Amino acid sequence: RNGRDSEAKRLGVKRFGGESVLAGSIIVRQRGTKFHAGANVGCGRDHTLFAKADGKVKFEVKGPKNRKFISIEAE
Amino acid sequence: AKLHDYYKDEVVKKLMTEFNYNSVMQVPRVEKITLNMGVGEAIADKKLLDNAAADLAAISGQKPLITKARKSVAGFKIRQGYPIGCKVTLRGERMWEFFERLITIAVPRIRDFRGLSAKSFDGRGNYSMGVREQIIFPEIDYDKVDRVRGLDITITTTAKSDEEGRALLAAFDFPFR
Amino acid sequence: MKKDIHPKYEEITASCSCGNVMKIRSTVGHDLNLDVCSKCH
Amino acid sequence: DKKSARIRRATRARRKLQELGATRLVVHRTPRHIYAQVIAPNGSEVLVAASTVEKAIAEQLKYTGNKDAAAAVGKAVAERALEKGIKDVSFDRSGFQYHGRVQALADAAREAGLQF
RNA sequence: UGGGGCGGUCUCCUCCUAAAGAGUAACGGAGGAGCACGAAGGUUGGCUAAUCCUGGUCGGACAUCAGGAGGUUAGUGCAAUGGCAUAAGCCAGCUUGACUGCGAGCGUGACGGCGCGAGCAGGUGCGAAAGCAGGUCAUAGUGAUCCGGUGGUUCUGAAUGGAA
RNA sequence: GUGCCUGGCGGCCGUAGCGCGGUGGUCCCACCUGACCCCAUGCCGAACUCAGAAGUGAAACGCCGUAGCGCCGAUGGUAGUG
RNA sequence: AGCUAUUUAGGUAGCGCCUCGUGAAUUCAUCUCCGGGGGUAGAGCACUGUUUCGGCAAGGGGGUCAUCCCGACUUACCAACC
């Protein structure tokens, strides 16, 4: 048997790279840690990446294991 | 330790000519030895381990560590997190002192033992040997013991070759064959 | 050496009828004689 | 292995500091010698590197590798920390157990005047 | 309900459906929840597998020892997806932040409502300190309003002082 | 003027990594001796730590070769597609 | 002629969509250049599933038998894992 499905959680990147954001704005709502927090970016309890300061988003790849990092350049 | 200095003198000069070791650090040094006591009957008897634990401590000079059940084998009625194994490691000064306790009076105490099954190696210079009894060790009182608990000894050295590891056993008057 | 968990030792001279009487840090009770040993087997 | 495990033991707190932007103070400890240096928050350049290998201090020491020697270098770096202009520094474990000489070195920085 | 009686379904979570933002239907396809934990929570410190390969008291492919390869194929209170060693996985010490008052700015909704959150004030705890802690790896574990109960609080209390 | 040495902290995360062979020790480093006590092992100075240090370059680690693999990789064609 | 909810399903309410009024920032749209995360088409077989035949081939059965506990040969037969 089946015939039931949950309602979508509306995830994804809320603010794409290259966007001037305000502090506290949500950048990425994910389940796991597909994207790790970088500079001026905090990671919520729900692994939701938000802005610690104002500035433009800079999606980058760092670390020895090549994982994506989101940093904000307060410019 | 009497044979620790005995090791420091005649064993190294013996090794320098047998395999032409151009370094004294290139000689295999006898490291830790473990006295394994995997009882296996600890499925319901909590008291059974305490004997072979304290007895293993009586055989050695320290209290052994209780080895918990790693996997979950339904065949032996065990799951992850069950106290069943028991082991004690002799390393350092007391490593040599216990070696004296065995190769002098305890090894010839094994019935009809004039030579050992030498081909029981690991492949990387370390020797293993299990004994079915406990009586062979001088610490056993014989009359107070209620069951034959056999222990297993591992000779972990830094030797990489088995015959080079057995060469280390040769310098300690080991009855082989 | 962690305290309280260790049994005590004693300077036990492994006595032999031939003369292989040598001291061993052991924990039995006394010094006993026997024939079959390292150099009397 | 010893060295490899130490680095994987220190990397936890070290990543927290590079996001905190704090001026760190790393400590390298070996049986024969003990090092202590200051690193600017950018991560590449170092400022003051006072260690036991500096013979200008070894001529006043007995044997590099003991507690008092750790207290000697901690004094030297903390004094030169102010001599170059480093006020507040965050101490770093660098994987070493905060008990022996490292604790002696950390005390030496605190009694000299360095802030932390 | 492809007409109805017989069986299912109705709220919530995961995957596919779903056409690389989000969303996205079927009596379409696979599964689960209606709790749990005083610690499985916080912090400090430490540690890291599975699976086999060898010689081994009983003991054998299948306990336990050591070596080796191997590499996260292990594990994560629970379903699946994502995540994880800087471990969130495992062990231990110390503890109660499973804290009160707020909340820049945000994501998600027609709305009700839900979710994330730096920083600020009081005060508490762990660590030498830097710092960290307002539940748990995250996503389910729950329901509006009315009526009424228990405790606190002069805020009101229909002449005034009280009380209901 | 710098060169070869090791060690420390990063940038950059495989053209940077394994594998094989060859070297390296005054210095640095690792290993090593001892451990009543600082501290520690749910057993053991293995690790942790202190006090020290003779010896060695074996192991580890560094470096030099080797491309047997790994990894990297256009031009062009093809698949697909607005 | 959609979304959400509804003893709701040819009804109704909120938002979307239309009109009139008023008020506002090159605000909005098209193309070019630049900055982006995506993982579908295609492609591929490390992982996750699964295919086929072939090999190993355990349980072995039964006989030349042991005509006691073993099991050798074994016609060859699926063929747990790899």
3-state secondary structure of C8: coil
Chain A 16-55, CB < 7 Å to strand G: 16-19, 34
Q: How many domains does chain B have?
A: 1
Rounded, the Å distance between the CA of C21 and C1' of E3 is 108
Q: Which domain holds residue B175?
A: 1-177
- Give all domains of chain D, ordered by start, each with its CATH number: 1-116 (3.30.420.100)
- Which nucleotides along chain F are within 7 A of a protein C-beta? 7-14, 28-32, 34-53, 55-61
The span from the CA of C10 to the CA of C27, in Å, is 6
Residues making up chain C, counted from first to last: 41
The span from the CA of B46 to the CA of A44, in Å, is 47
What are the tokens at D57?
């201090």
Please give the sequence-ordered ranges of beta strands (E in DSSP) within chain A, or none if there are none: 12-13, 20-21, 26-29, 35-37, 41-43, 49-51, 55-62, 67-73
Q: Residue A5 falls within a domain, yes or no?
A: no
- Give the CB-side neighbour count of residue A24, counting CA atoms within 13 A: 0
Q: Which domain holds residue A39?
A: 11-75
Q: How many domains does chain C have?
A: 1
Angle at which helices D67-84 and D101-112 cross, to 10°? 40
The CATH number linked to B10 is 3.30.1440.10
Angstrom distances, CA of residue D19 to CA of A63, B160, D15, D16: 14, 46, 7, 5
What is the DSSP pairing of strand A35-37 with strand A67-73?
parallel
Other CB atoms closer than 10 Å to residue C39's CB: what's the count? 11
Q: Does B touch C (3+ CB pairs < 8 Å)?
A: yes
3-state secondary structure of A59: strand
Q: Residue A1 falls within a domain, yes or no?
A: no
Rounded, the Å distance between the CA of D31 and C1' of E164 is 84
Angstrom distances, CA of residue D11 to CA of A66, B103, D93, D95: 17, 48, 10, 8
Q: Which domain holds residue C6?
A: 1-41
CB contact set of A60 (below 8 Å; sequence gap of 6+): A38, A68, A69, A70, A71
